Design a protein around this nucleic acid. Sequence first.
DNA 1: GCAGGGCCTCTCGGCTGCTGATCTTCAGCTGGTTGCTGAGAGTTGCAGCATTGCTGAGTCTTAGCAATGGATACTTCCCGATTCCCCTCACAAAAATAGGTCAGTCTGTCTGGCTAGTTCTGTACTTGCAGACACAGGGCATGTGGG
DNA 2: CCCACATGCCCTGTGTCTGCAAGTACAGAACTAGCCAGACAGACTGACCTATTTTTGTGAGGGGAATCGGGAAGTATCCATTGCTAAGACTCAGCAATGCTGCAACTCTCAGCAACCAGCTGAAGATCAGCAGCCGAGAGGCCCTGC
Lengths: 94, 94, 81, 82, 226, 226, 96, 98, 101, 101
Amino acid sequence: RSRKESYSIYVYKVLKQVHPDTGISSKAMGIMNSFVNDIFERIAGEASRLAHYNKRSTITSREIQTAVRLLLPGELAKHAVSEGTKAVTKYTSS
Amino acid sequence: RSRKESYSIYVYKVLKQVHPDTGISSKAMGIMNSFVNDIFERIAGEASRLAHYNKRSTITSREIQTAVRLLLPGELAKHAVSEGTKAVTKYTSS
Amino acid sequence: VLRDNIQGITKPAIRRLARRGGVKRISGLIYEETRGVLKVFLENVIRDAVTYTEHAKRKTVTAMDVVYALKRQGRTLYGFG
Amino acid sequence: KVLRDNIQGITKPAIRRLARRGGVKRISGLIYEETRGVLKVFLENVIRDAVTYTEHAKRKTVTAMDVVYALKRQGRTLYGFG
Amino acid sequence: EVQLQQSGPELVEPGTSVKMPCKASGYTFTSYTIQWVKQTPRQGLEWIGYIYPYNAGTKYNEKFKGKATLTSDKSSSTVYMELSSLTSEDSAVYYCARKSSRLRSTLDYWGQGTSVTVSDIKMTQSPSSMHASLGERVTITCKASQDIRSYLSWYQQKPWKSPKTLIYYATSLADGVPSRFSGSGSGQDFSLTINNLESDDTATYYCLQHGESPYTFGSGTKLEIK
Amino acid sequence: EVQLQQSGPELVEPGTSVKMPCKASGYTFTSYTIQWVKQTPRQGLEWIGYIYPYNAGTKYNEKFKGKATLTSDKSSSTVYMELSSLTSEDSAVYYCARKSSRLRSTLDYWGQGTSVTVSDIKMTQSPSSMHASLGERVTITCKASQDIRSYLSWYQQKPWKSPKTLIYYATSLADGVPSRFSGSGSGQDFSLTINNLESDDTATYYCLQHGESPYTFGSGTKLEIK
Amino acid sequence: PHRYRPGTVALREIRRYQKSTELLIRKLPFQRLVREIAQDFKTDLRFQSSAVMALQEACEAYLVGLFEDTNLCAIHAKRVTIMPKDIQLARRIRGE
Amino acid sequence: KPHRYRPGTVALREIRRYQKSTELLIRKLPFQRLVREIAQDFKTDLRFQSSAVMALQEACEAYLVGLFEDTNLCAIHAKRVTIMPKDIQLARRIRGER
Amino acid sequence: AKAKSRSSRAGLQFPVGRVHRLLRKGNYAERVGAGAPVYMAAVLEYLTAEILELAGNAARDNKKTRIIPRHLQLAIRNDEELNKLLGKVTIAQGGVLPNIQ
Amino acid sequence: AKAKSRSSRAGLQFPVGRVHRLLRKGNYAERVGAGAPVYMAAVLEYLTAEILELAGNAARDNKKTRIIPRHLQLAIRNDEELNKLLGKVTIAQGGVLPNIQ
DNA sequence: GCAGGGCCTCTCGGCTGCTGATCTTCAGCTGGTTGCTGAGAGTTGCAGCATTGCTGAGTCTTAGCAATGGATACTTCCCGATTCCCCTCACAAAAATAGGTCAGTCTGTCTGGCTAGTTCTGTACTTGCAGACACAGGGCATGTGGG
DNA sequence: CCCACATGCCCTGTGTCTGCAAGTACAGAACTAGCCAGACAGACTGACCTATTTTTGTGAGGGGAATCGGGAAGTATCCATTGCTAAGACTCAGCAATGCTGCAACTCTCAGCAACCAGCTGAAGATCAGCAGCCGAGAGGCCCTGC
């Protein structure tokens, strides 16, 4: 009872936008929360290591893109790079 | 020249302490440097992870001791805990 | 105090595990070896879990501590936080 | 200049010497092509990550420290090059 | 770099069976599905099925079950396709194309085509044939039947050549395709726009959906220049 | 938990061979070497050699090659020892002791001893035997011949019993040893001090070095209480 | 009386147990084994119900993944019966 | 009659010889040409430090020697002394690379 | 002025602000750039969308309207790139593949 | 007052101040306690002392008075706990363990 | 290869519990705005380093050949693992209970960051010098064809 | 089982040479000393949750006999590898010139941090129909036996 703070509502909006009629169980939500957390620590650790290697003090979208290219295999990296570049371009134009 | 800052003089001091007549080559010197950096990174990462799990903001000798217990196998962890405890007690006694 | 509960992992349980693993025929000496391997793996996970709870100054082993103990051996588990 | 077909530069006695260091007494004739394919796959897997590190550093020269990072993030930590 | 080699033309008498290869090179063979597309002058491009060489998994079209049989050979990186009991309406050129297992990806690289001769969602392209000079703007509409969540691709096919991917995911440019081409639209309405024409742009343009299980192409649009 | 089981006494005629086991349990068997120590009343404790069950690595005393042979069996966690051409001066009690491969660690756990009867650094213990009452301060010295970098252990042996470790690394308390025992010294001069005595400190106290390859024990110090 | 030749019941068991997701080790014996193992590390310990559950999923997944490699070693030795030498070889190649 | 060793004696001699030395067993210039050709497909006009090519070489020799150790283990398990591509494939599959 | 979420600014469903807070509190770097949480939220959103769509397709083929960890396990293990990404990951109540040949 | 090194106060040879600076600058925690670099330098000093002494013993048995990577590799691979600590580590110019027979 | 009798999952109905989707409330965390500052980008230059080319000695590879011993196929046979039946014994579920541990709130305090000055120690650089690499010559364990 | 000749390797001896250890400026980082504030420890206190008892009506486990079928052992074949040799060819070492890229230094400006506040998003708690589980009956593929 101290604000557990999961990703469950965001995973729900994503699920309702790619499959408007299917639902999800609480066990599968726990699996997918663990998945989102694990990928967050992987990408953030790789970006932190890249920034430490290049003697930078800030983590930027370049570091995030290089971490994504290092960690995701195959066309997953290409599509995630496209998604991240598209979102950064949309955010910059406000 | 940008002061590359190895562990070479300290490892040479330890070598002359445990083997007063035995020298070391430069390649074995670099390998021992890599060993010190790797073990430092492992124990520091485990201590930082422990402090993040227990919602602490500081790394102390308890976190270092628990990380040593987690990473070193068998009697290595016992003797390293003994050395760390002895050095911390000696430093506290000033 | 509990003594000799490794035989609680019964022979049909090991056979069911091998059937899920895709094994058609099982030798009679497989079961004791499987009990030894499972005991070694369980000791390796449980020791790290107990280390996590003892660093937390707790006395109950939690699922999150079991998850950390599994994750630090490269055996990441999903579904428990 | 463009190089072509240098996987055959890893000769049959070189693979034989690596097998003898591995403790292998007898070597089949089809071992060498399979070993060349395996070594090639390992080399692209390491070199792609090393080139990724080099490109993130905005450099054209692949360094030993980049090779060490590419090996370390694949669980193949190498001591002796930094 | 990525090549999908096929066989030559097969002059084959009716009633027999034919097998053609789709030997692939330049990429990791098990990471990409190999999809098979047939082409007739009468009803255009048609999707037959695919093989995923990672797990030998298949999925076929409704009207090609029994007519088609897909096999994979992981050792030689070759995909074979069996056509059995060849009816007179099987004289066609059969293309094999590479598609990644990602839902966003499409048929990016194609084979040259094997001409074998025997001795649901409907996608409507609003123009059938258009004419243009060397410098205007030309649009192509690909009105869809059901809702597809931006899973639409655009292809350019020269006469007697393999199709070339232009747009995937209804907006994204393919590899090597210049910024002159531009796709737009989502849901049921889609559009392909060419900025200015050249002599190279004289081709036939198709739109392919891959939202639901049977992949369906468009009717086709011939572009004529000057 | 950690125990090193052994066999019974062996009444053996001269000239033949004998095998005694050191079946051990309660720990990871390959991680710890098993050292072998003979004990005669004439010469005290004498270190024979050790086996390393991880790589079958063996090292013997200089005076014990040919006489002794050490083999390991990883399946039953058992360590064997063969004595060949048994001379009349081989009647002793043979102990097997566990020791970690770390240089700091010592012979911590011992076996009970098998009594087999047949039908270089010198370490000096300055008190041969001492007498003390119930609450006194006692001190045993173990001056060495060469230099050892604090690689000294201390042992307490009840009569007709296995030795028990008190001090390792010349200062550190062993497992379960009370804080009355205190070791000190480095280099060549060492001291063992027992704080307040009871009736159960009536034993013989030995000091063992493991700084160089033949491990040598002390002469022993019989401590008598009231 | 109906009798099956040795093996078809086994492939039916493979098809049955590869389709289910339920745990195949009995929960109370696994819990007793877990508490006996943890008793050697700390006296009078305590467990959440989900901690033993997570231990059970980890252990069953590890044993299933070990039995797949054991079966692969058994087919490599031109057999169909898995043996402790196949378990040992699979663990040795895995590095355990 | 000229001297002829039986098959296996020379092989055990090379096992004993090459298990003692620490030298690199692949020739440096063919390995360097292979490394440059492989890296050509990722970035054109690349440059390589000599220590970088040497580090790649030590990594490749260590990986191949460990894989040949596991392959010999598979060959002994199949009651053979001749290592085979199926033995390499089984070792690489159990290791998690296939 | 009226407050606008950075997720709505980037056209995402994942929280850019929460990803920023976890990047700052997670002890990764001294500073965090402005576009890095946007990029991370987009990459995480693409990965959850791909796995959820494949699991929903598996649940549709299993004639169910709910995604369970069995459907998630089928979706991840039937894909080369997802199985390479999540090779050392155990999915609880996931089972194994039916190994149909 | 005359400055005393923290390594000299702890009785170590490894740099307590440099280890503290690397802990502070390495992005591990928000703050670092006083005894944590002392414990870190002690553990590192013990580990290098053990490895260097075993490698010097290997050099002495090889009748050499200089430690090389072959001696380091022999000392590491002839030990359970050093092998488990450095299992996934390649030592350059270290070779392999010679077989028994 | 073809046909008849058990039987073991699929398919369908339909009812049933349970759990996941939705609504409501509150708290806390994200966004807006301002100001401050230091981190990284940009420009110029410099040294250092990787690329290329040429030459020459020389070690390594390659193709062909013989002959051997190891992998493979076939057969026997016998060990042992499967399958079924019964009977029995712990697993599971469910309700209750006590007590013991864990999490929350408040308070004070000690300890770690911050800042400025100082000095000292660790690094780059440059010597000499001896451990180890080089060839070369006895000597030993054994490799392999006769007896 | 013993011998022979023959060959590969360890050891000894000495020149040498390159790499290692020791000695000097020097500048960057560690230490010293106040100072401030906030993270964590200490003590109450509620309250959840974990261990422990008891019943029970089952579902899974264990033991034994019959039998089939797979693993182990022995034999013969043949083929595929190993060892060896002479010719080529390609690696390696050394030296020199080049231009090209990786550092270094100074400037500055722009992007990111700090802080405060209000308000909007998200977590916790109830609630409920609809999805999935459960039980029962019918059909079809499949296995076992027989011809």
